[PDB]
């Protein structure tokens, strides 16, 4: 997250760290959202590589013991069948991870609320991106969970020529674009939390930013629109 602030410890308890085994240790690669005690929603492109993955729930500081973390292996990966690695701009950037064990829910570990199927937010809707991703273009991961205020940019504006043009699809949510605050590498797969009827719900799964950089004026951060995938998510869980 570029132009973020450190989140309060108990703020976003559905946020997870997706990590891969690296030598004798673990490296954060992506965010995700705990949606069941044994299911995490993330981006498909986070799990393209044939790596060993683990999920960390209740995490806040990547580099120190918080006394709140639970560590769980990834048992099964279900990527959207239409996902194409060579074509992130086609969409379908979404995957479900079945955890080897059910995690314990507490103040630091809670299920993310998902929007109703088909829901589209009005332009300039209040949302927060959260994650441990780079804090500057070509920078380094945040040690502590960051948040940034990123209001939505609706499909009509986002798909216009001076924004993303045809790269953005109706199956996506754009947020931000002010040249200051954005998602960045390492936030992928994480949530965009938007306030709807008094309740934060996860309306986005972080997907991509501009090749020009993370915080780029009129290149809002692009998220898979979670409300486009409710039936698919329900079907995967019901059948695994
Ligand atoms: Ca920690």
Swiss-Prot record:
Known EC number: 3.4.21.36
Catalytic activity as recorded in UniProt: Hydrolysis of proteins, including elastin. Preferential cleavage: Ala-|-Xaa
SUPFAM superfamilies: Trypsin-like serine proteases
Keywords linked to the UniProt accession: Calcium, Disulfide bond, Hydrolase, Metal-binding, Protease, Secreted, Serine protease, Signal, Zymogen
UniProt record, GO biological process: proteolysis
Tissue-by-tissue expression: Pancreas. Basal layers of the epidermis, hair follicle and sebaceous gland epithelia (at protein level).
Disulfide bonds: 30-46, 127-194, 158-174, 184-214
Name of one Pfam family that matches: Trypsin
Bound cofactor: record note: Binds 1 Ca(2+) ion per subunit.
Similarity remark: Belongs to the peptidase S1 family. Elastase subfamily.
Name of the featured protein: Chymotrypsin-like elastase family member 1
Source organism: Sus scrofa (Pig)
